[PDB]
Amino acid sequence: SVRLSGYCGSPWRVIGYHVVVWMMAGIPLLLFRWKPLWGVRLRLRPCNLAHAETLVIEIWQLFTVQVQTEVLRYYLFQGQRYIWIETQQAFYQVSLLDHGRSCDDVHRSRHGLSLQDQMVRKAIYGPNVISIPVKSYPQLLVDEALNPYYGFQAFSIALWLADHYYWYALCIFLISSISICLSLYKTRKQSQTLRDMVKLSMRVCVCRPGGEEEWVDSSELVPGDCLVLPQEGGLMPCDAALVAGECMVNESSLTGESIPVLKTALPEGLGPYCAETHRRHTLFCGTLILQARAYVGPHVLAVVTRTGFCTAKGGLVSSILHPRPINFKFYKHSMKFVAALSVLALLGTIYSIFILYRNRVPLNEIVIRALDLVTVVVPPALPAAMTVCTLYAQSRLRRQGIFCIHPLRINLGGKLQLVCFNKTGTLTEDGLDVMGVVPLKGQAFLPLVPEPRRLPVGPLLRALATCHALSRLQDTPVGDPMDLKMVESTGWVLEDSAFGTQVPVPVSVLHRFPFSSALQRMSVVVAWPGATQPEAYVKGSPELVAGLCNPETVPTDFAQMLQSYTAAGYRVVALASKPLPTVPSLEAAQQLTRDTVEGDLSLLGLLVMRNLLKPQTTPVIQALRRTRIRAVMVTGDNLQTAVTVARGCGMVAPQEHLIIVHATHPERGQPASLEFLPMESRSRHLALSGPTFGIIVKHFPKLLPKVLVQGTVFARMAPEQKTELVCELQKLQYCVGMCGDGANDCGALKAADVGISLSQAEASVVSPFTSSMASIECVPMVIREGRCSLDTSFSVFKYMALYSLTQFISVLILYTINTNLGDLQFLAIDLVITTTVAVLMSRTGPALVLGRVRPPGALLSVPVLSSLLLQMVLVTGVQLGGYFLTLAQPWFVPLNRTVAAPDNLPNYENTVVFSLSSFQYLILAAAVSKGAPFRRPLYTNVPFLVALALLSSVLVGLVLVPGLLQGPLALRNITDTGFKLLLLGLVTLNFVGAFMLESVLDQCLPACLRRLRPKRASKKRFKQLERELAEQPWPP
């Protein structure tokens, strides 16, 4: 639902808002950007929608859009135009302006659009361009800079400049600059990814009225304008309708199919034009026109129907630009985690105030010091660390061949519990092998014919020859693999279509009804010289096409004979025919409606084909099943063929049980029923058809959750039915992945949490995830990358918490003794060590093999907080032990407490505290960076390992080498080598203790947590169902 509110302009209110929010504080700006309804209300007054100059859009969220005026006044929301329809006093989308008009109207527009009426609907519809905003760098820098995080960083820069910490202020500025530039690079890269995809700049003829032509730019086209498509072919600038001609288009860019598609001129009728019904007669935007030819007239004519964001390509671009929110929250209780850190910081700030008071510090100094301590806990490198983590994940995927348009989905990749796969072309090979055709003699089958060439000239041979949709493109037949191989098997050659016998008269296709996956069949009307009347041949599902056949034609053993082949893994389609008494002419043949042709058929035979598993499918499915990720086959193919393939690829193990859930439609006077008939060979799977799925959904809502929870093979599913299944699975708190192929899986790929397409270009719009490899091996790759990304994000958050608390503790320890950490020492710690390490941790790749344990979903967990608390206990212990150890030495000299820092540097206390803490930052970085299960070992990250080794060597030189970096850093020289070695020993103790603490926690905390308090249940609805089925299996 949506709602609109109009806000008429007024200067007094605007200036009042400006002065109030500028003089008062930045807090009102913060709450306005958090609650912008108040901001808009205060800025301007509600007004009648007719005069509104600004609107607020809810869907409940509010987006403020200005109302452009040209009078024609409109507005753009998410790239979609809405104009002011004066008569109705409302804003209607321009997508609906001509919605529902007739095909005869398109054929009338055929003549062209007069230039006086062209500019009108250019204004209403706007330019024909899917325009992605290209921005000046200042605009970006403003967009990131106005982040409140960078506002606090600038406040810190000013605060530390006010205290004469120039190097630390420069350090903060440089780190924030790095973060901002990384964000700019990220946004710029995504924007170019979109723009390069939506590029279009070309000149296209327009059939201007009066019989003349004109070369206008592609962006001057408007719906109702007439195109002249080139004969040699070219890209399509906008959605259109063919009014005259024939076109061979490659719609791979829009839908991912590399098989050429034929487009025919639009029929004439008093029915509503549509891009779904007349998809065959309509060209799309961004699809390539391989070749065009005009049946009648000098040139091929098309009439534009949608432009800009109205087009299907525009809709996909809009969905990419403005994606639906990711419901899953990767980091549970993040606000409470940062609050648990902030409470510790606040207790430390109270301690700081108390001690600074106890040392008789001036009040202004006390407040400045407390503000400094508050700024210490906010790390300037956190945004850079997060951005770099995401960038590294994306780069790793890209190197593996996987492209993601929404990088936020990479983390969902590691959340997957269920992956749905389409069978043909995803699990099994694209190519077929015609194993033979089973003919019929009366009402009985005949032995399979391995070579359909040997068939006698008759209805079955001609049905095989000419029941398809193939087009010779560059002297090579192209089209469906099934059609290609089935025609190849007969020996007839292609040349509205005519076929020459192998060596028996040429056969002509009068009319052809294309294959629709909803119908799962196609048909032709065919005549040959010497033919009494045309004949129609229907090819489609053996089950479905047999229903169209006359009962006396279909043999009594039809189902058993079909199962003989499909249960052996073969793809089978039935061929049926019927004589059409119509005169054998193109005009009369085209008169027939599809429904009349499809029914009352006579079965001719079964075409048996052999599609084999990809060799990469069984390993991947066994790997997924090994890690308790559900593999589900969602296919439009036979149930027996699909079940055989599922057993073959390991979706159903040899020792596991499979039950065929069969639902019967509720006949007259009786209710619907379910039959469960097991078939001979977690451990119990269900296999069911599309009709059964629909019956169970409509009539058995109570049993549907169980069918979904233990259903593995979903056969004979229509595309919308695959989408419905994915949505139903997601209703059970499943994170559903979908590995799809073509138009039959686009809805499921959109609905799925992770949708993957296999044989794709470098950058594609088909699905959120696209890959270049043909196999489904990209699925484990995506899951592994998502798990690595979750683990890396958790490790980076842990390191930033640990680094902050460590700096906080050291600065508190130094405040307690009336000194500080020195200026170039802040610069060193924050820039050289910590930023380097934090931006290098996240470059280590995923583990090579998936595992049964999933990454944690909550930052605020007992393991995480126990780890941080014990790590900080050890850090504080080491620092305070070093401090109380330097006091016991004989050469020690207490600092000049009278003058506060930085006046009293160098001193021994600061020297020791800085050395220990500077080692502890590296120690903590190495500790948080873990390997198995979700990541590779630390030492496989050469930049990170080298940074650790180099920084450790530099710090050891600082501690040992006399006079090294002591002037700059303000370090007190310590001659005693025994104390230096004892400091290094304490550092080694800290390292060993940190690593052993992490190992002990990881190994023994989950078990103690389980024993102490077992989980009563799981909120995952599907896990509740899984357990409930465990006590009582549903099918008895």
Ligand SMILES: CC(C)CCC[C@@H](C)[C@H]1CC[C@H]2[C@@H]3CC=C4C[C@@H](OC(=O)CCC(=O)O)CC[C@]4(C)[C@H]3CC[C@]12C
């Ligand atoms: C005073 C010195 C010690 C400052 C230390 C800071 C560096 C460790 C940081 C600052 C920003 C970091 C850079 C942030 C951005 C990235 C991008 C990253 O590559 C990608 O993310 C995508 C690559 C592609 O598109 O193919 C390579 C590392 C790099 C340059 C990082 C390398 C390490 C850098 C230079």
Ligand SMILES: CC(C)CCC[C@@H](C)[C@H]1CC[C@H]2[C@@H]3CC=C4C[C@@H](OC(=O)CCC(=O)O)CC[C@]4(C)[C@H]3CC[C@]12C
């Ligand atoms: C007083 C002096 C002697 C001490 C100062 C030492 C630092 C300036 C050195 C020590 C380790 C060095 C870092 C060691 C490793 C790297 C990784 C390098 O980035 C990459 O290699 C990414 C390559 C890719 O991913 O393609 C950027 C430089 C950097 C941060 C170096 C920057 C300078 C550092 C921080």
Ligand SMILES: Nc1ncnc2c1ncn2[C@@H]1O[C@H](COP(=O)(O)OP(=O)(O)OP(=O)(O)O)[C@@H](O)[C@H]1O
């Ligand atoms: N060119 C064609 N002519 C006639 N019938 C066809 C043709 N192509 C497919 N069929 C039949 O229609 C059905 C549709 O299955 P199809 O594979 O197109 O659906 P799908 O959902 O894409 O399946 P998958 O997920 O396995 O790709 C098949 O069972 C097949 O028997």
Ligand SMILES: [Mg+2]
């Ligand atoms: Mg398919």
